[PDB]
Amino acid sequence: KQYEKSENDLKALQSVGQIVGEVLKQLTEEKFIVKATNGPRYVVGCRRQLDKSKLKPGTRVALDMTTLTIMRYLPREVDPLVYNMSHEDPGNVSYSEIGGLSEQIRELREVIELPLTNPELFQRVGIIPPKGCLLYGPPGTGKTLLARAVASQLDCNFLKVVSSSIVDKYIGESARLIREMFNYARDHQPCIIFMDEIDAIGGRRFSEGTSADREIQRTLMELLNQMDGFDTLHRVKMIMATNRPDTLDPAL
Amino acid sequence: KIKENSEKIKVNKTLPYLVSNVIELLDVDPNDQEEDGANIDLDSQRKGKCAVIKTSTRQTYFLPVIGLVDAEKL
Amino acid sequence: MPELAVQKVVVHPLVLLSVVDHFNRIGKVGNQKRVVGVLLGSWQKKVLDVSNSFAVPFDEDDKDDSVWFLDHDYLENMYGMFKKVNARERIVGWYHTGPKLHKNDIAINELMKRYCPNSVLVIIDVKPKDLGLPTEAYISVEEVHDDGTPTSKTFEHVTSEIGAEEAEEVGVEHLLRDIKDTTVGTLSQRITNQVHGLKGLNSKLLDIRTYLEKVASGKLPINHHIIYQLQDVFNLLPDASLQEFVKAFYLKTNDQMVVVYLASLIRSVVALHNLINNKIANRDAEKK
Amino acid sequence: RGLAVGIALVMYGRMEEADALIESLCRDKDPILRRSGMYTVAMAYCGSGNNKAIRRLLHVAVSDVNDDVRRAAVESLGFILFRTPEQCPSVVSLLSESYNPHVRYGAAMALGVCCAGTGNKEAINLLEPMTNDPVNYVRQGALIASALIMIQQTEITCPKVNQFRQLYSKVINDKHDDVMAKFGAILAQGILDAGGHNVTISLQSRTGHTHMPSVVGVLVFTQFWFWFPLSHFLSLAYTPTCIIGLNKDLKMPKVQYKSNCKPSTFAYPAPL
Amino acid sequence: MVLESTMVCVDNSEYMRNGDFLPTRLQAQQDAVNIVCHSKTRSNPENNVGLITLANDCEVLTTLTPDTGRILSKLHTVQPKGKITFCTGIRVAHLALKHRQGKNHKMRIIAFVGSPVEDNEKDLVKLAKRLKKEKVNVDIINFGEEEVNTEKLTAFVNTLNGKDGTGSHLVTVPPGPSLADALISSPILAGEGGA
Amino acid sequence: APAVDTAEQVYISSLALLKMLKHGRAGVPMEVMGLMLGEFVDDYTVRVIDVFAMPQSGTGVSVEAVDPVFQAKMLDMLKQTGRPEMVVGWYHSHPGFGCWLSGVDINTQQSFEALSERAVAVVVDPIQSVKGKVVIDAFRLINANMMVLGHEPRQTTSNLGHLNKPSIQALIHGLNRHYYSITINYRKNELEQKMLLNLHKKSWMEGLTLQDYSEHCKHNESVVKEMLELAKNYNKAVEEEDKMTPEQLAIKNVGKQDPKRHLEEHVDVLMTSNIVQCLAAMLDTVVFK
Amino acid sequence: LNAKVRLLREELQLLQEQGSYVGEVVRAMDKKKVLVKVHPEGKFVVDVDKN
Amino acid sequence: EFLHAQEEVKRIQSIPLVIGQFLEAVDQNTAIVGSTTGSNYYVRILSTIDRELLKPNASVALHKHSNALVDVLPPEADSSIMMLTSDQKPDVMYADIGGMDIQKQEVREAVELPLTHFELYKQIGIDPPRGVLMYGPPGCGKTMLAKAVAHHTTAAFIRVVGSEFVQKYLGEGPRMVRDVFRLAKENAPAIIFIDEIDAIATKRFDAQT
């Protein structure tokens, strides 16, 4: 049993340190143009054996480090973080502990819960369900308790995301996580995505500030286009949570 | 025979060596993943359990993961 | 078993090479006898690319048809063995070693179908001849005869071409004391092609012609195909007609000449002076 | 290999019979036989040039890109053109341009043999680029060619003689050069100095017609590319040439002879 | 035998379906062909047997192997089409025998008869000269020409005997209930020089 | 360190070489191997008659890659052919690397060396190749010390040797440690050479063939139309082009995308095309009737 | 034409290299090493080839 | 022989290849490139390649063994993004933002009339538009006008998000801009639309980071 495990290790060492890439655009059947997840853009081949048809720009390929030929096909790109968000759906707090808020609770369902089962109900009206939910309130109310509490009771796929540390100073690395959650939800349809403390990403005019005021804006720009820009949601709903709607960008 | 193959592993186990984070754990079978067609058949996905690991040196590396390392933690 | 699944046949330089070698290798069994081998290659492809061949023992009588020996063991062991290395390559069929298509061939073919998943008849005309190709492709077709018995097994020709992988082409050049022959290329090659075409046409017409003499007297059958072909030639009556010329070629060289002269003018001073330097250069070199 | 060179050796001065042998050896499966065929014509023809022999060799080489033949044509020239010793550098000037290292090897070997006894200025310069080229055989052949012309000629005749020794030495001390070159260099040294410049290798004898042992000795010697004890054949090419007298009883008189030149300069000037 | 290449020729005739051997000739010959093979293997592991069919046109079924399995499977199948095509059986066998995976062994043909042999004296005599020159012997087990026919075969077998140390044999098996095995009468299980 | 060894000159047959290319291209990028069949003749020459492969595995060029099942199975069958051949050595391909052996690969070479010490490993490169002369090298493979001492050239005698560089200083160092490039000769002749020459007998039909007249007209039209576009630049070209400096000329008189090169190229296709089509139509007419 | 191919065999082995970089010279030192700053990688003090 | 010699060079020209981008030609023997790795190289140019199409900016291939300029790639190939929002177009037209007449007439004239037909605008005498800036209150809906025209053309609309230019992977960022712009030049005419430049490019940059 031990010998079998030992065997795969040699495969890496023969290729010398295998690297991930993606097919940018297909030049011809033999030659693809690959943009690397590691760095340089590459012109690549394919094994005789490995079919051309399988590779897609929506998905990832692997390359032999030393000759740059595609060894094989790899699955769709998803961030490590997003796998942890999907899992985080049962954080407990039942529907009993969030009561008294019940009138406001009914309003949240109309937006979030109804398009999952049937988008057909809003379709008969001849209207496309309203985009984005904003939860706001004075502190202690339980704006975050509510979003979280229903997600556990149904136990639907729910991405719970902390967005008050997702911005980093690492240019380009902050962008990817924010994109990935929208894309992912379209795939795992139906889904709900809730971002908590996105007051952080809520930006202002700034432009006399530190390096910290600068990173917030890139992320804030990205959200705008993703909602309404030329890209838009469907059955899947995106929920925001704030403390102040005043900290928010005027455009947002 | 285990010891000859592991010796190469031992040198990588010894210093210098990096820390990284796991982007995805694929964990597919060493048994047939699909019979590739085209010019010459065979399988090209003869990879065992695999992981796509991101180094902290802003490059991405593909790696076949061993079976001895517990699957659950990963 | 599959023979009908091939429209077009392509052969690597290897197969043409391999067959000549096998003939000797068996222990020099020939004359009346032939040598066969397996063809390994693709199938379930409209294009048949025969990858390799390896030697097989064989004794053939082609003057009789109730005796032949075919090695059973080799085919089977070879098909079983090969899957691990290449799952696509299977035994594609067998080559016959000339001089032409026989009815003697159906019999040998039948066995090959049973043993091997596929068969195909590639006929390589004898020991090395010709500038072009010597292989013809045939697939065994089942037809009705409206005068004899339905389900007869015969051979119908299919187009023969060549084709091979990149690495192999590169190998041919290294070994060889040129690269390839004519089929069409340069200005010289097109004209050769024309002369190549005439000697080639002439060969086809002899086959028909010798056959008619033999059918008329010596009583070889009268088939509708042979007669249909001959009649058409007289009927169509082609008439020579105008067109296809151009005069452009001269202007282009004239245009280039004026520029070529400006270059020679600058060149002249250096070229002229160099002549003296060379004779002296040889003395200096020898001295020091 | 043994049998192949041996077919060439037996001929000498019987021109016509060799024309038959060479074509047949060239057609064969064996590469070695192709090179031996050239030797066959070189010897049979050495006696007087003809057009026939050079013409035969020449067509095979141009036609094809085959290495083994291409060297053969150029090589074969020196032995046959021997009668007017200038000519071998004429044909070889066009052939030394060739990018094939084979041709380049064969160009140097040819120049070596023809010019050996009565030298040419043109022959010297042709050898220089072969030495330079980095391939192993071009270099060994070039260094041995240089020495052959230079035998029985003192190191004050021109500075080139001196230069040739320094080059040989450079290579043998070095490990940075090729093994094949170390053999050419040492051998080269060996030829130039042999018998302290009273032993010679020439195209013709001082009688006025061909000095058969010298001619024969060089060609059997040039192979060593595979198998190295082969180089020792060079001994037949080495022939002593010294003015010595004869007494009535067959012994050595200590008589004097006049010389037109100062005999002091020629007493081995400039050694290492 | 020790270092012999043997081709067993199988008879499959409309006289093999017969019930002269009890309960059926097919079965009784089936026990015989298996025995002959098990015996050679037990005798020498290096010994090999091959298969060709006498009946109809020539098919080379197996080239040289140790397998009893191949000869068994063929026997179950009957051929109403073809019986004993002797002249041809010898010729394919001689050719076949040459290429071997037990190389530089002696050359032997065992043919089972079990149908009247169609072939006349002119074929038979002709065949004997080809056999001498190639130096291959043929053995006949004769229950096929006592059943309603006179034995043509004996003269041919006698002449063939003594061309080497593994000579020919005429093995006599009755026609009526006695099976296709009465192998006791003359050697064939392994080679012997006598008749 | 002193030992009295001889080098193996590898004589590869035409049949054998071509198969080695075939296998190596196919294996890409994953490294694959196989055994060599041949004969041992003279006192150093191992000749490769033919080659077969051991399986394609991602565990390739290893002891494991070697299959006992293939080897036995072939050898019984080979006895029948009237050629049971010796295993002179083993070939492998690296299309992930050059002529520098891998770390597994050195052990694998050693196992072959135990069986027959006239064993070599030949490296076949088809996309890690820098030469179209077929980048192949031969190694017997002997230890490091032998190079360091300078013993290794004493053992090789009866060699010429050679050195090439597919991939930098690292490869050179790997090569030197081994046994460097030991000489490869080829056993070839004119019959084998003629087989490789071929293309199409179909040239017979094609030399005579000519197309529909409407097509002859399409070609003539397309070219004359094309020639008009380039013509306007051509005027400038002949008036000027005092410059001889390729970079300056390119900007000045549209020297790069030159009207001379292309217009000539165009007159030449049109002329040749019209001649062969026209010439064939007329030839056929006379002859068939 | 012969010259073009002659040149060609040498180029393949020559080209085999660890790459190139582009920088600028801030200052030279008297000893003939030059302090240059490579634009993507660090600053280096390194010598000139005068061939 | 020249052909067989050319074949030497054909084998080196193969994979592995890494893509650089050709800054300029000094000569037809040496040139300067700045590669996608995130490093620039001054490297040698071999034989059997064109510098005719490669003299102005284009993609180029280097061999990873040599780390020098072996081969060439077209200026068209290695385009980071070609199209988006013309095969992803919204179905929104001028009749779902039925009002704002002054605004509707301006967008239509600037964006639609040069894509559909460059000749007519130029014919009049007045230049066809080059750079468009769009300003106003945010509550009007600039993106929506952009949508209507995106639907109507159904070709030559390149949608690029300003965050998508910046990148974690090394050296891609300044390069990413070269690849998309260079493609607009080749498939002329085409419009490049940047949604918000008001949160990617800022008035204050601190440049300590």
Short mmCIF file of C-alpha atoms in Angstrom, two decimals, chain D residues 3-250:
data_model
loop_
_atom_site.label_atom_id
_atom_site.label_comp_id
_atom_site.label_asym_id
_atom_site.label_seq_id
_atom_site.Cartn_x
_atom_site.Cartn_y
_atom_site.Cartn_z
CA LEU D 3 41.02 -5.33 -45.24
CA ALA D 4 39.57 -2.12 -46.53
CA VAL D 5 42.84 -0.05 -46.63
CA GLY D 6 44.71 -3.14 -47.94
CA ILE D 7 42.85 -3.19 -51.31
CA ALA D 8 44.25 0.41 -52.04
CA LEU D 9 47.87 -0.41 -50.99
CA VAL D 10 48.58 -3.17 -53.47
CA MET D 11 48.05 -0.71 -56.49
CA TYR D 12 50.62 1.78 -57.54
CA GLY D 13 51.28 3.14 -61.10
CA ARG D 14 48.70 0.69 -62.70
CA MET D 15 46.04 3.47 -63.36
CA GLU D 16 43.19 1.72 -65.26
CA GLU D 17 42.30 -1.42 -63.07
CA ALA D 18 41.33 0.78 -60.01
CA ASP D 19 38.44 2.54 -61.91
CA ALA D 20 36.39 -0.75 -61.35
CA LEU D 21 37.03 -1.15 -57.57
CA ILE D 22 36.11 2.30 -56.34
CA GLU D 23 32.53 2.57 -57.56
CA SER D 24 31.69 -0.91 -56.05
CA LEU D 25 33.15 -0.04 -52.58
CA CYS D 26 31.23 3.29 -52.59
CA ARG D 27 27.81 1.67 -53.36
CA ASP D 28 28.11 -0.79 -50.37
CA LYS D 29 26.35 -0.78 -47.00
CA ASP D 30 29.61 -0.13 -45.10
CA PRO D 31 30.72 3.65 -44.60
CA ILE D 32 34.44 2.55 -44.31
CA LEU D 33 34.57 1.04 -47.72
CA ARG D 34 33.54 4.39 -49.22
CA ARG D 35 36.76 6.06 -47.83
CA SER D 36 38.99 3.16 -48.91
CA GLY D 37 37.85 3.47 -52.45
CA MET D 38 39.36 6.95 -52.68
CA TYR D 39 42.65 5.55 -51.51
CA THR D 40 42.42 3.00 -54.35
CA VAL D 41 42.33 5.60 -57.11
CA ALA D 42 44.89 7.87 -55.37
CA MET D 43 47.53 5.21 -55.51
CA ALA D 44 46.84 3.68 -58.91
CA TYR D 45 46.89 7.20 -60.47
CA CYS D 46 49.97 8.44 -58.58
CA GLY D 47 52.50 8.43 -61.39
CA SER D 48 50.86 11.02 -63.64
CA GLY D 49 47.66 12.98 -63.55
CA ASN D 50 44.74 12.39 -65.71
CA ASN D 51 41.44 13.91 -66.04
CA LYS D 52 39.61 10.52 -65.53
CA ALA D 53 40.29 9.89 -61.90
CA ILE D 54 39.44 13.41 -60.53
CA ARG D 55 36.25 13.48 -62.73
CA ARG D 56 34.99 10.18 -61.26
CA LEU D 57 35.37 11.24 -57.71
CA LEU D 58 34.01 14.66 -58.24
CA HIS D 59 30.52 13.68 -59.54
CA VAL D 60 29.64 11.48 -56.52
CA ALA D 61 30.50 14.17 -54.05
CA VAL D 62 28.42 17.08 -55.57
CA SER D 63 25.35 14.96 -56.31
CA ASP D 64 24.69 14.13 -52.72
CA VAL D 65 24.91 15.51 -49.26
CA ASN D 66 26.61 12.18 -48.14
CA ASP D 67 29.54 12.95 -45.88
CA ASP D 68 31.64 9.84 -46.51
CA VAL D 69 31.91 10.48 -50.32
CA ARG D 70 32.22 14.26 -50.02
CA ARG D 71 35.48 14.03 -48.08
CA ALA D 72 36.61 11.29 -50.51
CA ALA D 73 36.62 13.47 -53.57
CA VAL D 74 38.67 16.26 -52.22
CA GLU D 75 41.15 13.85 -50.46
CA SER D 76 41.87 11.90 -53.54
CA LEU D 77 43.28 14.93 -55.42
CA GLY D 78 46.72 15.41 -53.84
CA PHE D 79 48.21 12.14 -54.77
CA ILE D 80 47.24 12.37 -58.45
CA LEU D 81 47.95 16.06 -59.05
CA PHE D 82 51.45 15.52 -57.62
CA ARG D 83 53.24 16.21 -60.99
CA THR D 84 52.45 20.05 -60.87
CA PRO D 85 52.22 20.56 -57.09
CA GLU D 86 50.47 23.98 -57.34
CA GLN D 87 47.29 22.52 -58.60
CA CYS D 88 46.05 20.77 -55.49
CA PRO D 89 45.46 24.24 -53.67
CA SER D 90 43.64 25.46 -56.81
CA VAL D 91 40.79 22.78 -56.63
CA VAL D 92 40.82 22.73 -52.88
CA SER D 93 40.27 26.62 -52.58
CA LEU D 94 36.58 26.23 -53.73
CA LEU D 95 36.21 22.86 -51.63
CA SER D 96 37.64 24.36 -48.25
CA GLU D 97 34.59 26.82 -48.24
CA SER D 98 32.17 23.89 -47.69
CA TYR D 99 30.39 23.85 -44.39
CA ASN D 100 30.49 20.09 -44.13
CA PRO D 101 33.31 19.26 -41.63
CA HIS D 102 33.88 16.25 -43.74
CA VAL D 103 34.91 18.27 -46.80
CA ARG D 104 37.01 20.54 -44.60
CA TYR D 105 38.84 17.48 -43.17
CA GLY D 106 39.34 16.09 -46.67
CA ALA D 107 40.69 19.45 -48.03
CA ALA D 108 43.42 19.58 -45.40
CA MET D 109 44.59 15.86 -45.90
CA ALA D 110 44.89 16.43 -49.65
CA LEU D 111 47.02 19.63 -49.34
CA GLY D 112 49.27 17.78 -46.91
CA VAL D 113 50.22 14.93 -49.21
CA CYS D 114 50.72 16.92 -52.52
CA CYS D 115 52.81 19.76 -51.22
CA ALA D 116 55.00 17.64 -48.89
CA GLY D 117 58.36 17.86 -50.70
CA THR D 118 57.99 21.01 -52.83
CA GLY D 119 55.74 23.52 -50.89
CA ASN D 120 53.34 26.36 -51.82
CA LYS D 121 52.40 29.58 -50.12
CA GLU D 122 48.63 29.11 -50.92
CA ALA D 123 48.52 25.67 -49.26
CA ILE D 124 49.58 27.13 -45.90
CA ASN D 125 46.72 29.65 -45.55
CA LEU D 126 43.94 27.18 -46.52
CA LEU D 127 44.82 25.05 -43.40
CA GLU D 128 44.33 27.96 -40.89
CA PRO D 129 40.43 27.97 -40.75
CA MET D 130 40.24 24.21 -40.38
CA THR D 131 42.39 24.50 -37.20
CA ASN D 132 39.94 27.16 -35.95
CA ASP D 133 36.74 25.31 -36.53
CA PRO D 134 35.68 23.57 -33.26
CA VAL D 135 34.86 20.08 -34.71
CA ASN D 136 37.30 17.42 -33.63
CA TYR D 137 38.49 15.82 -36.88
CA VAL D 138 39.01 19.12 -38.83
CA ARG D 139 41.44 20.26 -36.26
CA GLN D 140 43.48 17.04 -36.03
CA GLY D 141 43.76 16.76 -39.77
CA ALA D 142 44.82 20.42 -40.19
CA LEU D 143 47.67 20.23 -37.63
CA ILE D 144 49.12 17.04 -39.19
CA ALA D 145 48.90 18.65 -42.72
CA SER D 146 50.91 21.66 -41.63
CA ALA D 147 53.82 19.46 -40.45
CA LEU D 148 54.12 17.34 -43.64
CA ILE D 149 55.03 20.23 -45.92
CA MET D 150 57.43 21.51 -43.28
CA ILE D 151 59.61 18.31 -42.87
CA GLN D 152 63.36 18.55 -43.75
CA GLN D 153 63.02 22.37 -43.45
CA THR D 154 64.74 24.29 -40.76
CA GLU D 155 63.30 26.75 -38.23
CA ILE D 156 64.68 29.87 -39.77
CA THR D 157 63.33 29.27 -43.30
CA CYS D 158 60.29 31.36 -42.50
CA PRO D 159 58.69 32.10 -39.05
CA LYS D 160 55.81 29.79 -39.69
CA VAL D 161 57.85 26.75 -38.82
CA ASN D 162 58.39 28.15 -35.38
CA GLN D 163 54.71 29.03 -35.02
CA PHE D 164 53.65 25.46 -35.93
CA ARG D 165 55.72 24.00 -33.06
CA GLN D 166 54.19 26.43 -30.51
CA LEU D 167 50.70 25.46 -31.52
CA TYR D 168 51.43 21.76 -31.14
CA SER D 169 52.75 22.36 -27.72
CA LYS D 170 49.88 24.52 -26.64
CA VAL D 171 47.46 21.72 -27.40
CA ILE D 172 49.36 18.90 -25.66
CA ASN D 173 49.78 20.91 -22.38
CA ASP D 174 46.11 21.80 -22.59
CA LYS D 175 43.10 19.63 -21.51
CA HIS D 176 40.87 22.43 -22.73
CA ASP D 177 41.27 21.10 -26.27
CA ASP D 178 39.95 17.99 -27.90
CA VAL D 179 41.56 14.46 -27.45
CA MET D 180 41.51 13.91 -31.17
CA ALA D 181 43.43 17.26 -31.59
CA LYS D 182 46.09 16.18 -29.00
CA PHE D 183 46.86 13.27 -31.24
CA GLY D 184 47.06 15.46 -34.32
CA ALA D 185 49.33 17.95 -32.50
CA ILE D 186 51.79 15.44 -31.10
CA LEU D 187 51.90 13.58 -34.39
CA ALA D 188 52.41 16.85 -36.08
CA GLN D 189 55.30 17.79 -33.98
CA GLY D 190 56.77 14.38 -34.60
CA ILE D 191 56.67 14.66 -38.36
CA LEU D 192 58.18 18.18 -38.50
CA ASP D 193 61.26 17.50 -36.30
CA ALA D 194 61.87 13.87 -37.38
CA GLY D 195 65.51 12.77 -37.73
CA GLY D 196 66.45 16.35 -36.72
CA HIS D 197 65.54 17.63 -40.14
CA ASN D 198 67.57 15.08 -42.16
CA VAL D 199 64.56 12.83 -42.62
CA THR D 200 62.05 13.74 -45.18
CA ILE D 201 58.54 12.98 -46.67
CA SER D 202 58.26 14.22 -50.26
CA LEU D 203 56.02 13.81 -53.25
CA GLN D 204 58.95 12.95 -55.55
CA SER D 205 62.52 11.71 -55.33
CA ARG D 206 65.50 13.83 -56.26
CA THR D 207 65.91 11.52 -59.32
CA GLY D 208 62.90 13.41 -60.76
CA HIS D 209 60.21 10.83 -60.56
CA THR D 210 58.04 9.43 -57.76
CA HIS D 211 59.50 8.41 -54.39
CA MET D 212 57.09 5.54 -53.79
CA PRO D 213 57.62 4.79 -49.96
CA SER D 214 56.83 8.39 -48.87
CA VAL D 215 53.50 8.64 -50.73
CA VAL D 216 52.33 5.25 -49.54
CA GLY D 217 53.22 5.86 -45.91
CA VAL D 218 51.08 8.94 -45.38
CA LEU D 219 47.72 7.75 -46.45
CA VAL D 220 47.76 4.44 -44.30
CA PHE D 221 48.83 6.70 -41.39
CA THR D 222 45.96 9.31 -41.59
CA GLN D 223 43.35 6.88 -40.20
CA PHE D 224 43.46 6.60 -36.49
CA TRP D 225 40.06 8.02 -35.75
CA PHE D 226 38.96 4.61 -34.71
CA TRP D 227 41.83 2.42 -33.40
CA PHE D 228 44.94 4.26 -32.28
CA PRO D 229 47.90 1.79 -32.75
CA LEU D 230 47.38 2.58 -36.57
CA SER D 231 49.49 5.80 -36.38
CA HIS D 232 52.80 3.90 -36.22
CA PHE D 233 52.68 3.19 -40.03
CA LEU D 234 54.10 6.74 -40.46
CA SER D 235 57.53 5.09 -40.15
CA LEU D 236 57.54 3.85 -43.85
CA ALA D 237 56.82 7.58 -44.95
CA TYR D 238 59.96 8.73 -43.03
CA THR D 239 63.02 8.21 -45.43
CA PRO D 240 66.67 9.41 -44.36
CA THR D 241 68.33 11.82 -46.76
CA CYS D 242 71.90 12.79 -45.98
CA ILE D 243 74.99 13.20 -48.22
CA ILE D 244 77.18 10.37 -47.37
CA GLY D 245 80.10 9.10 -49.36
CA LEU D 246 81.07 5.59 -50.57
CA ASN D 247 84.56 4.05 -50.26
CA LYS D 248 85.81 1.30 -52.49
CA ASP D 249 85.31 -1.25 -49.63
CA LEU D 250 81.82 -0.09 -48.68
#
